Design a protein around this ligand. Structure first.
Ligand SMILES: *[C@@H]1O[C@H](CO)[C@@H](O[C@@H]2O[C@H](CO)[C@@H](O)[C@H](O)[C@H]2NC(C)=O)[C@H](O)[C@H]1NC(C)=O
Ligand SMILES: *[C@@H]1O[C@H](CO)[C@@H](O[C@@H]2O[C@H](CO)[C@@H](O)[C@H](O)[C@H]2NC(C)=O)[C@H](O)[C@H]1NC(C)=O
Ligand SMILES: *[C@@H]1O[C@H](CO)[C@@H](O)[C@H](O)[C@H]1NC(C)=O
Ligand SMILES: *[C@@H]1O[C@H](CO)[C@@H](O)[C@H](O)[C@H]1NC(C)=O
Ligand SMILES: *[C@@H]1O[C@H](CO)[C@@H](O)[C@H](O)[C@H]1NC(C)=O
Ligand SMILES: *[C@@H]1O[C@H](CO)[C@@H](O)[C@H](O)[C@H]1NC(C)=O
Ligand SMILES: *[C@@H]1O[C@H](CO)[C@@H](O)[C@H](O)[C@H]1NC(C)=O
Ligand SMILES: *[C@@H]1O[C@H](CO)[C@@H](O)[C@H](O)[C@H]1NC(C)=O
Ligand SMILES: *[C@@H]1O[C@H](CO)[C@@H](O)[C@H](O)[C@H]1NC(C)=O
Lengths: 274, 347, 435, 80, 49
């Protein structure tokens, strides 16, 4: 069941998701998931091998997290220990004397007479029934908790493994790219792959641009910023990686006039020319 | 979170007397099991708190003015000036919330000496009773200053522009412009925003100015805060009150039983109290485990709420309050977080 | 560390901060206030002819001392049966009151005065009440004493009301526990003949009362035999009935305020801490209790009112580091001064890692270094931690540090400043979900 | 009898309490009971009353007032 | 106890034995009531979520 998920095929990006089945290879799906977080096609084309190497580097070190210093692995072992703890509490309680001469019914039948025997066996009986009731109650609570957690695991598979998530923190820290789930003792183990940026750069951005016309036409960037660089020429960059590109209708959308938009009279971008 | 409590099982059951102590051993590793279960519960609580505050941590911020950002008054949401009511990181509205809740001071530093010096005051005090009964309230992982710092760093978070991904870039966009963008995305054109700038700011300041008035048990959330406080107190009460149950013995005091009876009768009467106190301690441990599980799940929910309503704008309806969500703020509350969801309410 | 290896009970315990079992409390102190009590009056019992069983004599003793041994050695006990107390505890205790029912009774009938018996003694003569701690005694009086013998043993065999127009309906009248029979008035000093069906059977104001005295001329034994029904009460009075003792001098509490002391104050026995407070409650009652009947006050003979705080145990925790085999002790919520004064601590604390005052209480074994950490494995609360020493294996007292977020300055220009990444990496978050 | 004034309550013996409330059983009068009233005369010595659990007497309620015997002056308490 | 009916215990036994046998039923019923309350609280918290 969990191995069939690696090659699972659903609808393409930019579509509903469960209507069609698109046989798009794994690398193309990764590059689409990267394109949708704010990395333009030029960067992806340039950094193809670098991206593949970094993915193979991240995916080759997930085994090193199989220690109790890691949270999730420690939680796996916690679940295992809880399973063992229930059995240990069940088995150890049979040595509770509950105020009788012994915990062995054979000893009580060995040492006492009819009425005293019956009183001591009654002690043991009552204690064991109360402890069994407690065990049953805690098993009911644990099983209901585990059923809710199974529902959560199904939700996580549907949102993070079969699709890319736009919520922040649901599929780990950072910008979600792709997730994988394997089997674990008593549950599921997920590997959430996220985009972790380093080495930012300060650039000057514009809210939008406007020409000088009868009622002026104004543009705003699509999934990115209008940045200067590094009588001033404006460029477009993706929000997830700095690469100045010419402003076209592929990365700009027409918006209404605003007072914080720049007023351009020179080197007008192609969307703002008549 | 919940209040972290541990029990000195031997002192609680046998209250020091030696005959009880030797009679206690016919029940297995009971006291060790009680101690281990409580220890595990408190450890899980500490890990939950650490994960929560690591999740709500801000990594880039921008400067904010003291009284007015644009025309928005953020005074109640900011740490005040030299006033500094002995926390220096707790904001004004957080100060008001903590002043409107009645909490017994646990005396994490010198409470034992205070309890011995005071004497009369606070008859039936539960904080003082921990030294007689034999249970201990453990201090939280972080002191209020550091949690205040965590939740006060959130007011100036950057997170990147509203039309982009949200964790790749950091756009130093002022508070007023961020609010106006958040209103533009709910269906309010730029012309309306430009025309109604000061009106919008005045209505926002009207809204923030009146959130003090919700600190009453008529309000749902404040009553839930007090409910959590009362549940914390109720666990300690049920723990301390069970020591006067006689369980069918002549008395609930081991000294009286040792006073009035002979060896075999003494032993039977002490066994009664032993068995009763062990059963009640088992019940207390079970309920503490359930409460800690619930509090950890709710901490996960609180982290989700911060990431969706405080750091970003929500398109879901009813998740970040009633109406069209604009912006949310979070402060610290006793045993959890307190949220202020600002929503667009049309008339 | 041994308190840890034995409070969680294994050689191998991992690193952590654990609560452990404290050490015992001392009872050496004695605050005793005893009145100069008169002797209890065992003279009506020790002289004259004891009555019969249905005409028992009741003695109630309050505010006096008893020389019980002097009384126990006079009589010759044959059977006793105590419920809620024992004879040794009776001989060594202090009570609000002491109630004695005594009478003449033959040993051959001591099963007819047993709980649940079905004869005529429990129906018409005497039924023992079990509302208080009580005890039965059957004993023989030696002849040489001042006690004389009755003519015989007598009891009531039939008490009944005849009702109806023809007095043809016979209905028994039975006693309640601890009370006398209405038929006692027919023969107060004993029946003169076995079977004394009284000739007139006095007509009462609701019918005709009938008595029979088959309680015989039952031959007096060679030695007189008697029945005793003892009962004691606790907490019902300000004074006590206490044994004769000589207890030396412990009457002062003036310069023993704050120490755990045992006490015996007008009978009440316990241990606790006495602290001079403002007088509350009623001074006439001499004791102030709580809703659970626990002593929390006392009006002394010196004229001062003292709160009675139960003497408590100092909480204690062990910080343990397993890799370096290092440990430290936290006295939670206790100032170091009280630690330096007090005791009830283990052998190695007969005692530069000395008493250090923290926000969680006094600690032993931690060196204050004013360092900071970000991720630490031995948290102590209130943003304090304990760091294993890499070089001195002594644990150090560190603090959890809040790293500030970096500030990006908004521009004074038309647009705004944004930080856009120039490289990146692929992080991997691992998550376990139990199903 | 008014229970809100603690009318005719017998204090616990041998002990006292401060600044607390608690339930307690024993022998108490009934709230709103009027009782029998006697005036100090005639006819009282002829009437025999059951004692079953005892009784509580209120003495001197009309003192410092104006009245007269029933068979003009200032009233006083007369200790039944 | 000899029975689960207080009327039977009051029939067949005497004061001390009656008190002990009634204490048995008292303590058992209190423990079961505590269990019922705890499970109701758990069920109500679950239903609210
Ligand atoms: C309690 O009673 C015993 C027995 O009567 C008393 O013991 C006597 O004490 C005197 C002291 O002068 C001795 O001479 C007797 O020989 C003792 N008799 C016996 C049988 O031991 C004791 O003194 C009494 N105690 C008090 C203080 O009343
Ligand atoms: C019983 O006693 C109470 C207390 O004295 C009386 O209630 C008070 O009555 C006065 C006059 O009406 C009020 O001013 C107080 O506020 C009342 N106190 C409370 C707490 O109710 C009551 O009137 C008496 N009841 C009867 C039946 O006479
Ligand atoms: C931005 O500036 C760099 C540095 O001079 C230059 O190499 C790059 O081509 C510029 N981007 C443009 C012109 O889009
Ligand atoms: C652009 O021009 C308009 C006038 O039409 C002015 O209101 C606005 O401030 C200008 N914007 C900037 C940032 O230069
Ligand atoms: C901002 O609000 C505070 C109280 O919330 C008020 O005292 C202050 O006057 C307000 N500032 C302005 C400029 O009105
Ligand atoms: C007084 O009591 C005795 C028995 O104790 C009884 O015989 C006698 O009749 C009583 N007195 C009167 C006047 O009846
Ligand atoms: C620890 O040492 C620092 C060094 O300056 C001192 O200020 C502080 O009071 C000491 N104690 C604590 C609890 O920090
Ligand atoms: C790539 O990232 C690494 C660290 O993640 C950094 O050392 C290096 O300078 C980056 N390369 C470029 C071209 O920015
Ligand atoms: C009496 O108890 C109340 C709480 O019920 C408390 O507020 C008050 O201060 C107490 N009075 C004294 C004198 O302790």
């Amino acid at each position: 069941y969990t191995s069939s998920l690696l090659g699972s095929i659903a609808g393409a990006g930019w579509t509903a998701g469960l209507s069609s089945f698109a046989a798009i290879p794994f690398a193309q799906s990764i590059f689409y998931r990267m394109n949708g977080i704010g990395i333009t096609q030029q960067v992806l084309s340039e950094n193809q091998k670098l991206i593949a190497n970094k993915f193979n580097q991240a995916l080759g070190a997930m085994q090193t997290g199989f220690t109790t210093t890691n949270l999730a692995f420690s939680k796996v072992q916690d679940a295992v220990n809880a399973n063992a703890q229930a059995l240990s509490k069940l088995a150890s309680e049979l040595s509770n004397t509950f105020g009788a001469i012994s915990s062995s019914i054979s000893d009580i039948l060995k040492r006492l007479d009819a009425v005293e025997q019956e009183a001591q066996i009654d002690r043991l009986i009552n204690g064991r029934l109360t402890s069994l009731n407690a065990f049953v109650a805690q098993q009911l609570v644990r099983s209901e908790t585990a059923a809710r957690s199974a529902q959560l695991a199904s939700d996580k598979v549907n949102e993070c493994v079969k699709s890319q998530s736009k919520r922040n923190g649901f599929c780990g820290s950072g910008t979600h790219i792709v997730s994988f789930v394997i089997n674990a003792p008593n549950g599921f183990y997920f590997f959430h792959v996220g985009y972790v940026p380093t080495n930012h750069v300060n650039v000057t951005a514009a809210y939008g641009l406007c020409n000088t016309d009868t009622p002026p036409r104004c543009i705003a960037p699509i999934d990115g910023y209008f940045v200067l660089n590094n009588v001033d020429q404006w460029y477009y960059t993706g929000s997830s990686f700095f690469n100045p590109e010419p402003i076209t209708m592929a990365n700009a959308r027409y918006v209404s006039q605003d007072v914080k938009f720049e007023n351009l009279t020179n080197q007008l971008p192609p969307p703002l020319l008549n | 979170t919940i209040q972290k409590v541990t029990v000195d099982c031997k002192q609680y059951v046998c209250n020091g007397f030696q005959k009880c102590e030797q009679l206690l051993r016919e029940y297995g590793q009971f006291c060790a099991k009680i101690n281990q279960a409580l220890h595990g519960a408190n450890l899980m609580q500490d890990e939950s708190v650490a994960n929560l505050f690591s999740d709500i941590k801000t990594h880039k911020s921008q400067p904010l003015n003291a009284g007015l950002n644009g025309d928005f008054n953020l005074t109640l949401l900011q740490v005040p000036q030299v006033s500094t009511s002995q926390y220096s990181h707790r904001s004004a509205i957080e100060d008001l919330l903590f002043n409107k809740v009645t909490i017994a001071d646990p005396g994490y530093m010198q409470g034992y000496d205070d309890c011995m010096k005071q004497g009369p005051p606070s008859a039936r005090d539960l904080i003082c009773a921990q030294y007689v009964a034999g249970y201990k309230v453990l201090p939280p992982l972080y002191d209020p200053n550091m949690e205040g710092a965590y939740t006060s760093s959130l007011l100036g978070s950057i997170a990147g522009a509203g039309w982009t991904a949200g964790l790749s870039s950091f756009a130093a966009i002022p508070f007023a412009q961020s609010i106006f963008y958040r209103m533009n995305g709910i269906g309010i054109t730029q012309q309306v925003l430009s025309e109604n700038q000061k009106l919008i700011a005045n209505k926002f300041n009207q809204a923030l100015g009146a959130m003090q008035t919700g600190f009453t048990t008529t309000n749902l959330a404040f009553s839930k805060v007090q409910d959590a406080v009362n549940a914390n107190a109720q666990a300690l009460s049920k723990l301390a009150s069970e020591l006067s149950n006689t369980f069918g013995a002549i008395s609930s005091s081991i000294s009286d039983i040792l006073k009035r009876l002979d060896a075999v009768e003494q032993e039977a009467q002490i066994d009664r109290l032993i068995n009763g106190r062990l059963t009640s301690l088992n019940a207390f441990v079970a309920q503490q485990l359930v409460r800690s599980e619930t509090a950890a799940r709710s901490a996960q929910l609180a982290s989700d709420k911060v990431n969706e309503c405080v750091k970003s704008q929500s398109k879901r309806n009813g998740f970040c309050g009633s109406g069209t969500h604009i912006v949310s703020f979070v402060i610290n509350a006793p045993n959890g977080f307190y949220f202020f969801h600002v929503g667009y309410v049309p008339t | 560390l041994s308190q840890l290896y034995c409070s969680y009970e294994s050689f191998d315990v991992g690193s952590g901060v654990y609560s452990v079992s404290s050490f015992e409390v001392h009872s050496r102190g004695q605050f005793i206030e005893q009145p100069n009590s008169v002797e209890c009056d065992f003279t009506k019992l020790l002289s004259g002819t004891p009555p019969q069983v249905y005409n028992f004599n009741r003695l109630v003793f309050t505010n006096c001392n008893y020389n019980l041994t002097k009384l126990l050695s006079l009589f010759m006990v044959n059977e006793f049966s105590c419920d809620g107390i024992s004879p040794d505890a009776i001989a060594r205790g202090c009570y609000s009151s002491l109630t004695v029912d005594y009478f003449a009774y033959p040993l051959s009938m001591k099963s007819y005065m047993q709980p649940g018996s079905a004869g005529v003694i429990s129906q018409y003569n005497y039924k023992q009440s079990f509302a208080n701690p009580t005890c039965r005694i059957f004993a023989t009086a030696p002849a040489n004493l001042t006690i004389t013998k009755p003519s015989s043993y007598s009891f009531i065999s039939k008490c009944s009301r005849l009702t109806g127009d023809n007095s043809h309906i016979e209905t028994p009248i039975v006693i309640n526990p601890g009370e006398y029979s209405i038929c006692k008035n027919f023969a107060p000093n004993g029946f003169s003949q076995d079977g004394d069906y009284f000739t007139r059977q006095l007509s009462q104001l609701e019918g005709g009362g009938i008595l029979v005295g088959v309680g015989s001329v039952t031959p007096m034994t060679d030695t007189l035999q008697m029945g005793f029904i003892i009962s004691v009460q606790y907490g019902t009075d300000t004074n006590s009935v206490c044994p004769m003792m000589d207890l030396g001098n412990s009457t002062t509490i003036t310069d023993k305020l704050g120490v755990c002391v045992e006490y015996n104050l007008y009978g009440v026995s316990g241990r606790g801490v006495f602290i001079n407070c403002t007088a509350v409650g009623v001074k006439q009652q001499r004791f102030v209790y709580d809703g659970f009947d626990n002593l929390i006050g006392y009006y002394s003979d010196d004229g001062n009112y003292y709160c009675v705080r139960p003497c408590v145990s100092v909480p204690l925790s062990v910080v343990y580091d397993k890799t370096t085999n290092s440990h430290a002790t936290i006295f939670g919520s206790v100032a170091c001064e009280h630690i330096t004064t007090m005791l009830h601590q283990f052998s190695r604390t007969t005692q530069n890692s000395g008493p250090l005052q923290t926000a969680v209480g006094c600690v032993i074994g931690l060196v204050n270094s004013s360092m900071v950490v970000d991720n630490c494995q031995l948290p102590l609360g209130q943003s304090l931690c304990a760091v294993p020493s890499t070089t001195s294996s002594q644990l150090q007292l560190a603090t959890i540090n809040y790293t500030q977020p970096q500030l990006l300055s908004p521009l004074n220009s038309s647009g705004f400043v944004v930080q856009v990444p120039t490289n990146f990496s692929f992080g991997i978050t691992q998550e376990y979900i139990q199903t | 009898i008014n229970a809100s004034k603690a009318d005719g309550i017998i204090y616990p013996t041998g002990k006292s309490y401060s600044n607390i409330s608690l339930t307690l059983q024993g022998l108490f009068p009934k709230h709103g009971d009027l009782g029998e009233q006697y005036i100090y005369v005639s006819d009282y010595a002829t009437k025999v009353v059951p004692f079953n659990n005892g009784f509580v007497v209120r003495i001197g309620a009309a003192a410092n007032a104006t009245g007269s015997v029933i068979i003009q002056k200032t009233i006083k308490k007369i200790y039944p």
